[PDB]
Each structure stands twice: as C-alpha cells, then as structure tokens.
Ligand code: HEM
C-alpha cells in the first residue's frame with residue numbers, strides 16, 4: 661500500500677461523496693500506528709484476535725454494503741474505524757468534507 665492515496669471505493673458503486681483522503685503509509689506513520697491489526701483486524705465468533713491480522717484482505721470481503729447481524733455495513737465500518745479513532749484521540753479529520761475532500 662505504498663501507492664495508496666485514497667481509500668478504495670469500487671465496492672460502493674456510485675458515490676455520493678469524494679473518495680476519502682488516505683495516504684496509507686504516510687498516515688500510519690504520522691498517526692503513530694504500529695500494529696497493522698488496529699485496522700486489518702481478525703474477528704471470529706465475537707472475539708478479536710490480538711495477535712493476528714487480515715492484511716491483504718479488503719474490508720469489503722467481510723463487510724457487505726448492508727449490515728449483517730453486528731457486522732457493520734461497509735460505510736459504517738469505515739466511519740467507525742476511521743472517524744471513530746479520530747474522535748477518540750482528538751486528532752485527525754472529523755468533519756465530512758475534511759475526509760471527503762472536494763478537490
Ligand atoms: C480509515 C481508513 C482512516 C482514514 C480515511 C483516515 C484519514 C486521516 C487523514 C486524511 C488524516 C490527516 C492527514 C494524515 O494522513 O495524517 C488523518 C490523521 C490522523 N489519523 Fe486517521 N484515518 C483513518 C484511520 C485512523 C485510525 C484507525 C486511527 C487511530 C487508530 C487514526 C488516527 C489518526 C491520527 C492520530 C491522525 C493525526 C496525524 C497527525 O498529523 O498528528 N486514523 N487521518
């Protein structure tokens with residue numbers, strides 16, 4: 661993911677909003693995220709694996725557009741992960757057009 665500059669959007673089909681800005685490797689460095697499974701997590705039978713990750717598997721392989729039980733749909737998964745951390749840490753973009761940048 662060194663060439664990533666926005667979050668993948670093909671799984672959404674027609675977009676409402678601009679692709680979310682996300683230079684993956686520069687973001688993770690600036691945010692000080694060392695564990696890949698901060699995002700690329702492995703949930704099995706309601707248990708979060710502490711020492712595994714799902715690097716290489718798209719979020720959309722496990723997160724349909726619609727919610728399934730307590731597995732969030734794909735929009736909700738991104739918002740909870742991305743906007744959820746920014747709100748928890750009080751750092752990074754928490755307004756809609758600061759992620760979904762019109763440029
Ligand atoms: C989820 C894929 C996700 C997105 C999208 C996202 C975007 C984002 C931007 C565009 C910035 C500003 C520029 C930059 O890349 O530094 C930013 C900044 C921070 N983020 Fe973020 N972010 C996503 C996810 C996450 C997650 C899961 C965390 C916390 C675990 C996280 C944290 C942060 C932090 C901290 C910052 C500030 C960086 C700095 O300038 O200090 N983000 N994010």
Ligand code: HEM
Pocket residue numbers: 661667668684688693694695696697698699700715716717718719720
């Ligand atoms: C930990 C250092 C880490 C690794 C390693 C890593 C790898 C990685 C790859 C190989 C991909 C796919 C790139 C491609 O398609 O060419 C990828 C994609 C995404 N990642 Fe990642 N990633 C690591 C860490 C993190 C962290 C900490 C976050 C959350 C802030 C994160 C996020 C994402 C997202 C979003 C994508 C796109 C997923 C998709 O659906 O294709 N990664 N990562």
Ligand code: HEM
Pocket residue numbers: 699700701702703704705706707714717718719720721722723730731732736737738740741
């Ligand atoms: C891709 C980086 C990706 C994102 C974004 C994402 C988000 C996400 C959230 C925010 C939740 C809610 C719980 C939590 O905060 O962790 C969640 C829940 C589930 N996930 Fe996920 N997820 C991403 C990637 C993946 C991948 C690649 C898998 C499949 C291997 C996956 C699976 C799941 C499952 C299952 C859940 C539900 C957990 C539970 O409550 O039982 N995620 N995801």
Ligand code: HEM
Pocket residue numbers: 667668669672674675676677678679680681735738739742743746753754755756757758759760
């Ligand atoms: C502010 C409340 C806000 C809105 C509105 C919004 C909308 C939105 C939609 C409708 C989607 C689905 C795809 C589409 O464009 O149709 C979506 C997807 C993602 N979002 Fe978002 N979003 C708002 C807020 C935020 C913030 C503050 C962030 C960044 C932390 C963010 C990120 C993302 C990501 C990642 C996705 C999936 C990939 C993409 O579509 O770019 N959103 N959002």
Ligand SMILES: [As]
Pocket residue numbers: 685686689
């Ligand atoms: As670097």
Ligand SMILES: [As]
Pocket residue numbers: 743744747
């Ligand atoms: As929120």
Ligand SMILES: [As]
Pocket residue numbers: none
């Ligand atoms: As809250």
Ligand SMILES: [Zn+2]
Pocket residue numbers: 662
């Ligand atoms: Zn390189």
Ligand SMILES: [Zn+2]
Pocket residue numbers: 665666681761
């Ligand atoms: Zn851009």
Ligand SMILES: [Zn+2]
Pocket residue numbers: 685686689
């Ligand atoms: Zn750098």
Ligand SMILES: [Zn+2]
Pocket residue numbers: 696712713715
């Ligand atoms: Zn790993």
